[model samples]
Target: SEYELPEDPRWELPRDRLVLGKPLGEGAFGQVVLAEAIGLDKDKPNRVTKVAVKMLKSDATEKDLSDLISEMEMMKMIGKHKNIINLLGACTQDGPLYVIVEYASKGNLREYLQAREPPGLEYSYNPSHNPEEQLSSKDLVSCAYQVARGMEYLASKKCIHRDLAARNVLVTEDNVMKIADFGLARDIHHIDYYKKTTNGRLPVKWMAPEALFDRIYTHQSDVWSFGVLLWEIFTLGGSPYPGVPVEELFKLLKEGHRMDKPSNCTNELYMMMRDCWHAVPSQRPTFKQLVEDLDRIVALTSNQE
Candidate 1:
């Protein structure tokens, strides 16, 4: 669905210099608006810069604000990695909290898949349509490699990206995938680290068995999520567990049943995915290992016709 602008806008940046345009996208926590940072030079039209203003909703409470602050802190700490999403700045008004992010004109991986629809598909809801027909295996490998690289960078910093999905993976117009959204993310070694929410809308399907049942999340759990993310990319934004209810998915994964790899996915990629989805979290490959595996896949498919 196209992004709907908030009825009561809270962003009040320097309106004379910064021009806010239409909504680029929306998530559960906030909406991202397209804006251009305009300068006074009339001849230098190219000097104008585009960015995404992620504004938190008006009804956010103190706890929500604290969580946002944590995200902001982490973003500042992680500063600037090529595969990590760039944080331009942040704004804390009396009302809505705002984050100025680097504008990715091509949008998220999900939107990119939606744009490349297969022939004879009228709408996206059609289950029979094969996503592999539209997006080649090589493209999938490239995107997955980029995601793994981003995850490796985050892992190296000792941060666990709890929410790793297609929506959180932004793609540039040139198809460079950068990891975004650190709201649910946390440091792996924090002793007092318990997620604020218990049974809300968590990314259950993408979760590892230990995280699903025991609430014992770690870097391995993030790898499991990455495996599901690879499936999502390979299938051009297909749902993780098709035809399964959210509750049922929990039971299935808890019982060591995982969503099988897509039929058309390559053997090497499938093996890497299976290694990630291993029922025992200890057996799962680390993000560093995943980066190596994905790098091999990228090399194998780089020039393949």
Candidate 2:
């Protein structure tokens, strides 16, 4: 039972404080559960607050447990940012350790957008609980800008978001995007596992050519992935490189071919995505640059409203 982890006194939570509820989903390593934590806030003692709990499987190996710990460690290292998931507390002294974090009620960005299909040229469904709500253009631009801003922060922390995609981004009830899932090693079910297992689950379309050919990943490669994420946003979660088989993606990319502009996506925005797919790693714009561009677009968009 030696799931050894360096103690972070502030994040260590009492095991009995959490009331675990339903499992959100399961992966090869573990599952995230919906839960409520009591007395987590010293200022509001006895407050029952909803939280998302990440728990390892009972039969998990020591490595799996350690993997979970490192995932928490990375979050701790990154510290807190508006666009990154907040690490609330972790219960590591007991079996079935829990990593508690704020719950994103709106779920992942891909699913959220896909749920509201047939988007207009520049419109987004309202970011409210209303079933008939329309997502406006401003909302879409804001999501892009926020994610880029988040990536900008991560790059500043010397962290490369190896897996940057719309699905990996969680949207809160207020339509804020939170970059989720660090230490992809824990999510054996995720496409990132392809590198380890050499399986066919690779998220190749989201990867830069250097990443695919040389197994290299840098902030530039992340910029490429963010480009695909931009496509996901503009297309309302449409799959990248439509009609091109994954088998031929490398060859096509090698030949300088790239995805067409998504329907309803502006030439200006698509140009930004093109910038991400530049062959030379340094040719890709930094997330910081993208953030500034998106902010301009967001501002221009709101002016039209």
Lowest lDDT 10-mer window, candidate 2?
Answer: 185-194
lDDT score, candidate 2: 0.80
Residue by residue across 133-197, what tens digits does model 2's lDDT show?
65666777888999999999888776766778987899988889999877652222223322323
Q: Per-residue lDDT of 1-305 in model 1, one digit per residue for the tens?
A: 12232332323344455577899866556667998766423488347777887765666455565656667667866667878787765555444456667778787898788778533335446866655656665677888888898988887777878889998888886778899978778776555333424553457777777777777778888899999998887778789889999867766765767777776677778888889999888899999988887887787787665
In Å, residue 105's CA in model 2 sits off its true spot by: 0.5
TM-score of each: 0.81, 0.87
Each model's C-alpha lDDT?
0.74, 0.80
